[model samples]
Target chain A: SMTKTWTLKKHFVGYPTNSDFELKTSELPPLKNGEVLLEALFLTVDPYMRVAAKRLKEGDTMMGQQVAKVVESKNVALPKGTIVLASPGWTTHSISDGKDLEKLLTEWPDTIPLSLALGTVGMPGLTAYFGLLEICGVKGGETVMVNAAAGAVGSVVGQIAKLKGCKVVGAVGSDEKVAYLQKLGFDVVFNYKTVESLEETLKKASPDGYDCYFDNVGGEFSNTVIGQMKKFGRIAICGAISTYNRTGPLPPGPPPEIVIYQELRMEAFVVYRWQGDARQKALKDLLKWVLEGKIQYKEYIIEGFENMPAAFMGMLKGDNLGKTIVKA
Target chain B: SMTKTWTLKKHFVGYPTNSDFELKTSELPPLKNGEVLLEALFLTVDPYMRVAAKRLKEGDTMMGQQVAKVVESKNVALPKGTIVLASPGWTTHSISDGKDLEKLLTEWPDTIPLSLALGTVGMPGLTAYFGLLEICGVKGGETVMVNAAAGAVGSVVGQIAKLKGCKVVGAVGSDEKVAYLQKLGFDVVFNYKTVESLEETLKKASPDGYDCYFDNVGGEFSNTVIGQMKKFGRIAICGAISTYNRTGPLPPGPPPEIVIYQELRMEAFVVYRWQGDARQKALKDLLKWVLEGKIQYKEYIIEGFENMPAAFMGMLKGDNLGKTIVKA
Candidate 1:
């Protein structure tokens, strides 16, 4: 048996490109005791890849997590048909010890797709859930501002804020995105490209200033949105994708006025910090919501595992409408 | 009776100048039924006056709080010969309604100077207490950073952090100021005027990074300090005297990387916001600290009421040590 993989060809200098990775096929070793062979069904393409490039060198396998199925198993406790979560990079097949593999516990109602476990019911979904509920401590009637509102985490953030009985304001890069998120029940959506006064644009949109800010994009635009936060406002820095691709010095952060005067609180975090029980709680609720049709998910899935690099580049360029994933 | 007063002759365009004020003698009107003649005993020279100039124009009296003696009183409760805290500007004498006057509540034990009721046991002292204790929520063994380390609030903030069993790092303006704060027991003190590399300077000071920041000086230095904060750090934006008196724009704020990655919590506040119980508790604790010889203070006192304008100018230039006060 054989497994196909994507390896870094060169360190990414600026924005990522197809030339940065090369495909290689290798022999799949026989499964050992207490091991499971995973066939990658859906591999996630995420913003963290751009940042992870700084530590990755030439010839390193591209890092990511995937929704996988146990096609062959030597472990007595698990069967061959069980589905699991694994961080196996962009691989067509791989073997994993059950030590860190997460059991797919979603119950999988027909209305809730399996890929949602890779996205809406998984990492991105959990990122949005805990980042807002725990970090921001957002309450009903609060105003929330989410950047990259058309993307996975930002989209989920706005929807959850809306579910919390909040006034959700989303900052998008295009009118098409504004239209999409607005239909998802965002109270307000604005295209940053069409706006001039960054301060007034957000202020006019929220009118009363934000109580919580869910930041996916970073840089000067994030700083501008921060200016409009009210006193005691909370900001969750889930990802700074806008700053991830900078060629030079990263732009300054949010100005001191809002942080000092309005008494704003800005917090940045990675999801793994709150894994076990928190992750489980979010997954349960997210799945239940999707199954009940209260929460809707959209995934921009590329057809082949061979197209992972293109899909990664496209997602970074904002070419995707929702959660970007590759079907291997 | 005629009272000599300092009135704004010109709006301060940059750092204030003596020429920006004009000396005037105005005849005092007799006290009304609820009024008392406030004879100025001690006048304050502060940084906020420079910032307050932005909204003030020519011919407006300076805005400041002064310690005054009630010489003639028509109000029964605010009797003659009582000292009080009143907004009496730089005038030698003025009228107060007694409605807004605060009683001098410091139980003056020997060795605790009465003027400390204005400095260490007063507004500036409470500013440090609440901003550091409540806002930063700093604990023992944590590292703390404060700028304008020789000034009233910064000095007290550092001392409090020290008493709480934390390592204190201070950013001072001159070697003399650095020596002064070091003598006051700050573990690490650096002259910002001579230092560069915001990141390295702080990292060298507290290798593990800061747990709390009491920011009296905002902009680039504060931004740099932020980069060195450990996870779950706290920041209190008490003032930005470093940005004051600038003819141009204030520089950038903290970076998103630190704010997000570190999960830093920054809060800006004014002392008056905690006027009720918090202010009383701080005053009681601060007085106890001063009386028990746990806190030491030095005052920069200017002789004569006529030197008010000169003293104000000198204070803005960082010429004074400790609290800048003018005796009338």
Candidate 2:
């Protein structure tokens, strides 16, 4: 069998262009005694690939996660024909010993689609879960603010804050995402694209001051947003997509006085930091909420393996309303 | 008795000029039943005065701490002719009913000058002690870096780290302060004014990165230093002398990737936040170190209350090598 995967053609500069990646084909070897072969069912193209791809060589496979079907499993633990969460990168098929598979997909309810394992109920969902719940405890009646409100993690952060009895304000890029999030129960929303001044608008949107801030965009906006945090507010620095393509030492832009006078506690992490039992808890809670129609999620999915690069580039261009995924 | 005090002529904007303060003499009211009359022996001009001054209106006394001699006491618990710490602002004397005095001021050794109640053995010293001990928990053999290493707080931080068997690196503005801290047993020292790149030099100086950072100068220097920290590094942000003069929201300058990837835990506060039995413990240990001469200290004693403004301005200009004080 032949497997198709996107390989890094060159390191990205500023924004990724066509020349940065190339599609490559390789013949798959027969499965060994302990290995299982996975065929991609649903593939995800998240923002982390932009940052993580920098660590790869010119010909390395583009790193990503996907919900794949175990078409052939020599390992008895992972039965053939079962679906599993796998990190096969941007590939159609992968062989694994089940060591890295996020378990051969446990009880995915009929109420929620299995594709969510790569979006709402997958890594991004768990990122929002542990980031909001574990890292910066969102208590009742607190003011909470999140950036990229319509994106994968931000979508869940707003809903999680709502469930915890918090006032949620988020920054978005388009009106469609704004209306969509508002319908999903966000108390306040603003488009980052239209704001004349995020500093002033954010201050007004979170009038009483935010008790917890979940950050994704890292630059002037993120730094200025910290000023609107209340005393002892907890901040989670999950990603800085604004400077991901720009290579060099990041220019300084932290509001030190606000951080000092308010005694703010800041922590930064990737989703893997809370992956074991905490991840199981996040999965359980997220699945329960989505299955019961309590959690709202949207996926901007494109069919066929050839559209992966286009979909990813489009997501980076702020064209996607929610989590961008692909199906083969 | 009359006390000559520097009253705020107007709220400070940017830096405090002569027009912002006026020295005025005020007659003392007769001592009430529970009141204790204190004669200021040594007055302090701290960096906090620059920021705290904004909170006062025109003609209000500039806030600060002073070492005072209890000249007369109706509350005999403090007794007569006892020297203690008092917060009477920039003044020659103050009266208190014992509610605002920090403590009874205990275990001061004869070897250390009484003026230390306002500095070395006082707030600055205690600030370094608790900040390094209680806040971040610096242990032996870890690399520690502290900014403003020639100032009151930084001086103590280096010495305490030395006592705990840790490597200490300090950054200052001049060659004079570098020599001063080197004599105080700091393992490494850098003159911030002479360095080409703080990031490059800091990485080279640390080689293996810092485990704890004692911050006194906040701004670009502080935000950039986070990159030189090791995994699970602890940062104590005591003061931000760099931006105390500037108004409006503090300018942003922190790179989040370093803070996130390293899992750095940052905390900010003043010394008063850790008083009570904790304060007493810090006091006892500092006094013993000074008495044994294991800890070296210096004082930039600016004579006369009239020179308080000059002393304050000179300190802000980065002129003082150690604790800056005004004697009444």
Candidate 3:
């Protein structure tokens, strides 16, 4: 039987170009005991891919997690026709032992669409859930601000912050994202690119300085945002996508003396740190919110697995509204 | 009757050069009701003096709190010959109407020297006590690295870290401080100026990276120490005496990405925030350690109240060991 694959063709110095990836086709051996064969039904493209690629060496398979349907199974745990969530990277199909497959299948709600298993009710949802509540410790009536407000994690973070009784302010790259974030119950939303000054805009939006800052983009923008924090504020450092693709050394930006002066707490964490029971709890909560219609989600889908390179590139450029996904 | 007083003459920029300060004597009026007349017994000269002066206007009294004797009192609470403590700035005597004076006199142990009300048992002691146990959360058996390791706060902080079951490594500007820190139970001490490479020196001294960093002098030295921290390291930013005296706008340095990447927690705190209950608890613990001889303290006393400038200058130049005090 033949299998199709997308392999990492070259390593990128800064922003990855199309030349950094290549597509290929290959034959697969039969599945062994305790293993299953699955075909990719949908694949996710996100900003983390850029960061992960930077950590990976050249000639490795391009990394991504896909929502796949089990076509053939030798594993007793996963029967055929099971729609399993897998992290088999950018491939049409995968052969895996049941170990890593358990997370994608066991806890999912029956009536929900499988697409959400890759988004709001999946990794990104858990990222938003734990990063905000646990790291930022969003308090009732406290002001919470997030940059890249309409992105997959940012949008969900803003919504959850609202549910926790916080006044949410979001900063996005465009007016449409600003409007989208506002609809998600954000108290204030701004197009950070259009503003003459980030400090001024944030000050106008939140006259009383923010108590918690959910930073997704760490550059000059996030630097200025940190400066406007109230005393004893908490900063959840999620991603620095703004600096991920820089060619040379990272830019010399703002000093963190402000962090000290205000006695602010800033922590950077990876969701993988809370993979066991915490992930399950967060997924259950997210699913409950989604079913009640209290939680809303958006996905920017680009058809055809072959166009994943374009989709991935576009996601890095902030062209997607929510979770950027590719249908295989 | 007339009382002579010395007032703050000028503001200091760098190293508190002799010309930056001038001495002026003034006459004082009689005391009012509920007021007590305090004769300066021991004026505390500390690194905080430099910071406080930076925040003060040119003609304002040089900011400081001192342990004085109540030579005469009209108020019933405190009477004549009682050695009370007051924050009278740089002066020979001060009249207090029990406003901020109660903070200095209430419930001090009779066994402890009244001079301690200005040194190890006072602001510097509180800075070290809370900065270590609270901010850094020093754990038993963890290795802690401290800079400015023989100064007022650093001396106490190292001993406190030692008491907490941490192996303490100290970095100081001179060999004398290195010897002093070693005598104070520091596991390892180094003259930072003599080291060829700070990173290598720290790694050699502490085979494991420092778990907690207590920073007193902030500049290139702190950057080096921070780079040598282990994962999940904590940094207590007590003071940045290294840059306090810069003449112009401070030069730009390393961005906080270093902090983000290492997952370090650095907090700057004012002792006032942890005052009242927390202060009493820390003082009780500190006093216990002192009485048991588990903690040793030293003071560089410059005699003569009129030579307050000399004492202040000596402290800014790192000429004092442990707590620096001016005796009247």
Candidate 4:
């Protein structure tokens, strides 16, 4: 059967140019026992994709997770026509046994949109959930600040901080994104470009120093937030998209004096750090929030599987207000 | 009554040059209802003194804790001639009641040297004890690395790491200090000066990366050690004497990429962070090690309270192998 695949055409230096990837068509072999075939429905674009691309060698398939519909299956658990979330990368179809499928499909509610499994209900959602609550340990009545407010992980992080009784302040790159974050119940939202200084903005927004800082952009933005942290503040480092595309060697930022003087606890984590029971707990909480209408998610969708490269580039350029998804 | 006090002559900048402090003579006033008169016998010269001096204003008494004998007391609990420890600063005598003295004195064991109250049984000891076992969470059979290995806190840290069944390595300034660390049962000891590269030295000493790093000297040295840490490694930032006496602004070092990539946890601490029960537990363990002869300590003593400035200067210059003290 004909299958579509995306191949890495070249390695990226700073920002990924158009020549970095090449789309290819190929034939997929028939599935054996317990194997299931899936057709891609949605592809996810995240900040982590930039990090992963930098780490992976050239010629590797761009790494990402996607939501797909099972069209054929030898496995009884994942019957034909069943919709499941699969991390099949930039591909049109995938074949997998039922073993890892349960992690992506089980516990999904019937009333919920299957598209959420690629956004707020999936990896990025869990990343924000566990990173904020577990790593940062956001507490009640404390103020939590997030950068890249309109991005997928940042949006969820703000909402989760709110649910935890924290005052949420979000920083984005545009006025429109700031408005979107405000609509999502962010207590304070700002277009970072207009803000003269992050330190002054944060101080004016939350008079008491930030108790928890959820950082998506590393560099001067994080340095300023860390400097303004209250004693015993916690920072969850989920991404560093700010420096991911920088050319040449990046200059070192301020010293970690803020971490020492303030006795701040800063930790960077990937959601995979929490597996088994912890992962389940995070997903369950996220699902509950979605059902209660306490959590709202937005997606910047680009149609057609062929436009995956453009969608990925747009997301990296901060063109999306939430999870950037490509519908096949 | 005649009493001697070492009032802060001036604030120090860069290595605390001589003539920064002035010794003065004063007369003791009549005690209030809850007051006791303390006669100093031994004064402690700790690394915090150097760092804390930056926060001190001119005319402020130099900060320190000292072992003294109660000369007079209005509070019956602390009878006259009872030996006690106090933070009377660079003073020959001080007036304090039980209230402020409780944290500095507590109960001292008669079996141990009274000077131990300023060294192994005191602040530096507690810094090593809790900083290692609690903050760094040293585990049995793990590789532990310590910088400034022959200094007060580093010496105790190495011994405690060894007691915890960890394979200990020490990085000291001189060959003699390296030999001293080896005698203290360190598995590997290196004169950091002799080593061409800290990362190479650490890699050679322990092919497996260090699990816990007790950082007493923060600078390029610590940045190198951090790069050589294993996943989930913990660093106890007890002091940063390496950069303490800088004449100008401190230089920037490696970015915190090592911390983020390795998932390292670096905690800067003052012994005061742990209170009540936690402090008691650490002191108890330290006392046990002292009684068992499982720990050895050295004191570089300067005679007369007048030499407190010299003692402080010597400590900042790394002239002392262990705790630097002044006998008044």
lDDT of 4 by residue, A179-212 (tens): 8888999999998888887778889998878888
User: Which whole-number lDDT from 0 to 100 does residue A177 have in model 2?
Assistant: 90
lDDT of 3 at B292: 82
Evaluated at residue B190, the lDDT of candidate 4 is 94
lDDT tens readout by residue for model 2, B148-217: 9999889999999899999999999889898999899999899999999999889888888899999998
Candidate 1 segments whose C-alpha is farther than 4 A from its true place: A28-30, A77-79, A195-201, A249-255, B8-14, B195-198, B247-249
Sort all candidates by lDDT, best to worst: 2, 1, 4, 3
Question: Candidate 2 has what TM-score?
Answer: 0.89
What TM-score does candidate 4 get on C-alpha atoms?
0.90
* Model 2 bad stretches (over 4 Å): A18-20, A25-33, A57-59, A139-141, A195-206, A245-252, A275-277, B8-21, B25-37, B57-60, B72-82, B95-98, B194-201, B246-254
Looking at model 1, residue B274 earns an lDDT score of 79
Where does candidate 4 chain A have its weakest 10-residue lDDT segment? Answer: A249-258
Worst window of 10 by summed lDDT in candidate 4 chain B:
B100-109
Pairs with steric clashes in candidate 3: none
lDDT of 1 by residue, B17-120 (tens): 77889999999998899999998888988888877776777888898988888999999998999888888787999998888888876475755656677788
Number of the candidate with higher DockQ, 2 or 4? 2
Backbone clashes counted, model 2: 7
| lDDT: worst 10-residue window of model 2 chain A | A246-255
Say which candidate scores most in TM-score: 1
